[PDB]
Amino acid sequence: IRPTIGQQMETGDQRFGDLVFRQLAPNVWQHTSYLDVPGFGAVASNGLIVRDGGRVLVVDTAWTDDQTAQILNWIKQEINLPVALAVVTHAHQDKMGGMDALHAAGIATYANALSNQLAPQEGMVAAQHSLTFAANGWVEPATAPNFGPLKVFYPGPGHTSDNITVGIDGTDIAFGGCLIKDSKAKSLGNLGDADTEHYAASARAFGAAFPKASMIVMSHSAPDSRAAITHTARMADKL
Ligand SMILES: CC1(C)S[C@H]([C@@H](C=O)NC(=O)Cc2ccccc2)N[C@H]1C(=O)O
Ligand SMILES: [Cl-]
Ligand SMILES: [Zn+2]
Ligand SMILES: [Zn+2]
Ligand SMILES: [Zn+2]
């Protein structure tokens, strides 16, 4: 789609409307949507789709309701199984812009309690359910019922104070959202809402939470190696 930011199209990718889908594993797909900033071009944002038996789980919306409805259409066409729930990884437009489409479809939505509290101030609609976390960052399991392979971890403040991450159990994939940047990145992206003091520790805590994940998925670059984690932390060390 030639985005100004985000990965470019490659052989594995499937174009569907204005979105791009890439299979990462037999049961995991990356969804990519684009926001056109006037005079600046398209910014890509990635999330995940995970099949868990007879149901589908989603991580992050697209930028908009319409794009998010297109994700649901793609799932309907290509997988033809119901979406059980969606997790959104913090209260910004690239991750929560499409909440209304999820709610219209009857899909149960989950976010960090802090994301839900921040959502009005960030121009977002809150998720219908709040996740809470232990002092070491692991989600309280009572707040994440029937999450299947999704293992939710709060690594500490970084890109935002509310950013969360998700490992996919039964695979070697973990999703760092906007916290993690790729191994070739020259910046940490938008630090406007960031905690620059704690960023490096939070990036490394994500790595330690999922020590055997070899494929690191993130919001604005193609999936990368664990060097994404180490490079992000090294960049954050200089903050
Ligand atoms: C890609 C970014 C630099 S922008 C994005 C986030 C702000 O965090 N911003 C939004 O979601 C709102 C937005 C609206 C219109 C155009 C760009 C961003 N996330 C940043 C990041 O991951 O580093
Ligand atoms: Cl903002
Ligand atoms: Zn953000
Ligand atoms: Zn803000
Ligand atoms: Zn982002």
C-beta atoms surrounding 234 within 10 Å = 12
Nearest residue to 22 via CA among 163, 221, 229, 226: 221
Q: Are 180 and 159 in contact (CB under 8 A)?
A: no
Total number of domains in the chain:
1
> What resolution does the deposited structure have, in angstroms?
1.5
Query: Ligand 5 center to residue 11 CA distance, Å?
Result: 24
Known binding site for substrate: residues? 181, 190
The CA distance from 127 to 77, in Å, is: 25
Structure determined via: X-ray
CB-based contacts of 232, cutoff 8 Å, min separation 6: 176, 179, 180, 181, 185, 188, 203
The CA distance from 16 to 89, in Å, is: 24
Q: Domain with 219 in it: what CATH number?
A: 3.60.15.10
Angle at 144 between CA 44 and CA 116, to 5 degrees: 55
CB-based contacts of 136, cutoff 8 Å, min separation 6: none
CB-based contacts of 70, cutoff 8 Å, min separation 6: 16, 17, 18, 19, 33, 62
Residues with CB under 6 A from ligand 1: 35, 37, 43, 92-94, 178, 189-190, 219-220
Q: What is the DSSP string of the chain?
A: ---SBSPPP-TTEEEETTEEEEEEETTEEEEEEEEEETTTEEEEEEEEEEEETTEEEEE---SSHHHHHHHHHHHHHHT---EEEEE--SSSHHHHTTHHHHHHTT-EEEEEHHHHHHGGGGT-PPPSEEE-B-TTSBBPGGGSTT-TTEEEE---SSSSSS--EEEETTTTEEE-TTT---TT-SS----TT--TTTHHHHHHHHHHHSTT--EEE-SSS--B-THHHHHHHHHHHT-
Query: Ligand 1 center to residue 170 CA distance, Å?
Result: 31
Query: Ligand 4 center to residue 156 CA distance, Å?
Result: 17
Q: Domain limits at 222?
A: 1-239
The CA distance from 124 to 111, in Å, is: 12
- Edge-first strand order for the sheet with 55-59 is 13-16, 19-25, 28-37, 41-52, 55-59, 83-87, 108-112, 129-131
